[PDB]
């Protein structure tokens, strides 16, 4: 293989020889697809893409395209050298911190010519916390009511005291709510407050407050034995008082911290990076022409941002994904193949990824890093034949860790099912395997360690999942049982515990729709959170095939107890030999192979 160097002292005027490296991945990917259409002989053995140790920073994603396509004989690769650590960067340096009491300032730098505002904030490569009102989670309030009608969310006086001023206004301009709702959390951002005695009348901003009030599933917790949601307040400066808590004003242009044991904000040594934006890497062809036969081995991926929430509030339906209209209906609507009647509309729309391949084959992760990052880490969103994604690691998630395949088309009625004529479109034969995932959905407590929509042939195995909010492993879309693209999925040997940190309606495999010939198998789950605001305390599961779950053979998976829902399922799934009884050998084997275990 030829190489192509770059380096963090790099210019790309160089001609990326490793004495003279480029220094953006950019040129260098431009140079070796001129090689390609020139067919120069440093082609025949591959490309490799050699990058120096360092941090390489982006202002606009990388965009790998038909015309930089592999072949079998000849892949792109992009690494590091020797062992050596590489970071593509989405975000920026803040500086020029000035103290100010127990808080420390500094001034947000423009970004691509404009002011930068963002939702997460690294320091030292540990992220700090958006200012909130409680600390701990376990002692969040509950709301009191809804009124629908008005658009009113009633929650305690008490609660959104310190977001109002001496005549009961709102006095935080850009304050958010995150309500917990039954399976997601909503990022809702505060309009006004009118005190109402004992009760505060909280009002939000459109587009989301339409959505959220209008929505049925999920929908807030109103009840009589003490489970109404619980939500958190944040974006406020009148939040920000522990260490390790940050505001940034958006109008002032200027970002408050309370620095943390050994964090010395003037000194080099301490970095703070604020994420600048959503994408780094963009794998993107067409059907017709396809990106191929792509390779990226030890890269690491961080600080990317997504800031639709701030934009436009945050009401998914699952999953992370939002809604963009969703509404009851009445009379239901009855559905063909003994499907069950259907109370509820829902389109949706697809959170940021930090690396995104959409048409294309063989385009494969060999121990990367998904680290600090502001939504999803890998998506493999449309028309993917292919690809092997293998010993990665995800980490410091706000969103999904890994995302595949779709959640029906931005027009397609997320209930009707999903089966394109051009088949193209669907992505098949992903293989998953060797990954540890801990500490995503950090933020979108609704997200998943690995999200598998409609996909088909896909290998999910020998993963390893630990601290998620919600379930472990999602397969599947649509609450149909009509049979639809679906076919061959497999959910093999994986490694789940400690997950429903924060939601419940939840399992360590969970699957949704009709899937010929689909296969759990081998898995072992246990050790699951009990969160105290949870909607129902019960409605935890280790497995749980949900609605139109047909074909799907649930076998030999080692659980902690016997405790699985199979909720409005389609025909034919086979339920065998699940539970703590299932043998050691298998026990044992799931999760992380030895040659992959490194990542921990
Ligand atoms: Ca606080």
């Keep these: 293989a030829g190489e192509i160097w770059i380096s963090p002292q790099g210019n790309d005027l160089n001609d990326g020889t490793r004495p003279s ?31 120096e140790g360092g941090t390489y920073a982006l202002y606009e994603p990388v965009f790998i395209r038909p015309e930089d396509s592999g072949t079998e004989d000849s892949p792109t690769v992009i690494r590091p050298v020797a062992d050596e650590k590489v970071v593509l960067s989405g975000g920026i340096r803040i500086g020029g911190w000035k103290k100010q009491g127990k808080l420390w300032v500094a001034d947000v730098p423009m970004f691509n010519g404009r002011p930068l505002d963002f939702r997460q904030l690294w320091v030292n490569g540990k992220k700090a916390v958006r200012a909130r009102d409680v600390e701990d989670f376990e002692k969040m309030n509950r709301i009191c009511s809804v009124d629908e009608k008005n658009e009113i969310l009633y929650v305690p006086a008490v609660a959104i005291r310190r977001l109002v001023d001496g005549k009961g206004a709102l006095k935080a301009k850009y304050a958010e709510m995150v309500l917990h709702q039954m399976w997601c959390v909503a990022n809702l951002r505060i309009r006004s407050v009118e005190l109402a005695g004992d009760s505060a009348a909280i009002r939000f901003h459109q587009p989301e407050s339409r959505i959220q009030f209008e929505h049925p599933w999920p929908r807030p917790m109103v009840t009589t034995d003490g489970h109404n949601s619980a939500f958190y307040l944040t974006n406020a400066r009148e939040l920000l008082d522990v260490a390790g808590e940050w505001y940034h004003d958006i109008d002032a242009r200027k970002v408050y911290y309370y620095p943390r044991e050994g964090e010395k904000l003037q000194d080099a040594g301490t970095e703070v990076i604020v994420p600048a934006i959503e994408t780094l890497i963009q794998v993107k062809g067409t059907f ?42 009445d009379p239901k609507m009855e559905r063909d193949y003994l499907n069950h009647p259907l109370d509820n509309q829902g389109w949706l729309g697809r959170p940021a990824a930090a690396v995104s391949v959409a048409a294309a084959n063989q385009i494969d992760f060999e121990r990367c890093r998904f680290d600090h990052l502001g939504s999803t880490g890998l998506d493999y969103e449309e028309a993917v034949q292919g690809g092997v994604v293998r010993g990665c690691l995800f980490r410091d998630i706000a969103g999904n860790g890994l995302v595949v395949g779709s959640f029906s088309p931005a027009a397609h009625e997320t209930h009707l099912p999903y089966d394109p004529t051009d088949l193209r479109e669907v992505c098949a034969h992903q293989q998953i395997s060797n990954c540890y995932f801990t500490e995503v959905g950090n933020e979108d407590w609704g997200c998943l360690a690995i999200l598998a929509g409609y996909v088909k042939d896909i290998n999910i195995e020998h993963n390893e999942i630990c601290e998620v909010p919600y379930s472990g492993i999602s397969l599947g879309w649509g609450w149909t049982q009509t049979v639809n693209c679906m076919r061959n999925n497999r959910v093999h040997a994986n490694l789940i515990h400690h997950y429903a940190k924060h939601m419940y309606d939840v399992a360590g495999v969970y699957t949704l ?45 080692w659980t902690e107890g016997e405790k699985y829902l199979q909720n409005a399922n389609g025909p034919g799934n086979v339920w065998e030999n699940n539970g703590p009884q299932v043998d050691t050998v298998i026990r044992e084997r799931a999760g992380l192979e030895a040659e992959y275990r490194d990542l921990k």
Excluded at 34 to 49: A, L
Excluded at 517 to 546: A, M, R
């Design 288 to 329: 017709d022409r396809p990106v191929s036969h792509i390779r990226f081995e030890k890269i690491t991926f961080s600080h990317t941002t997504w800031m639709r929430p701030s934009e436009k509030g945050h009401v998914p339906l699952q999953a992370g994904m939002y809604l963009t209209d969703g509404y009851r209906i």
């Design 513 to 557: 729709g009709s899937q010929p010939k689909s296969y759990v198998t081998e898995n072992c789950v246990h050790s699951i959170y009990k969160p105290g605001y949870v909607h129902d305390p019960n409605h935890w599961f280790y497995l749980y095939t949900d609605e139109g779950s047909s074909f799907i053979t649930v076998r030999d998976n």
């Design 21 to 51: 490296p480029k220094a953006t991945l950019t040129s260098a990917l431009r140079q070796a697809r001129e090689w390609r259409r020139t067919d120069d002989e440093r082609v025949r053995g591959g490309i490799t893409i050699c990058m």
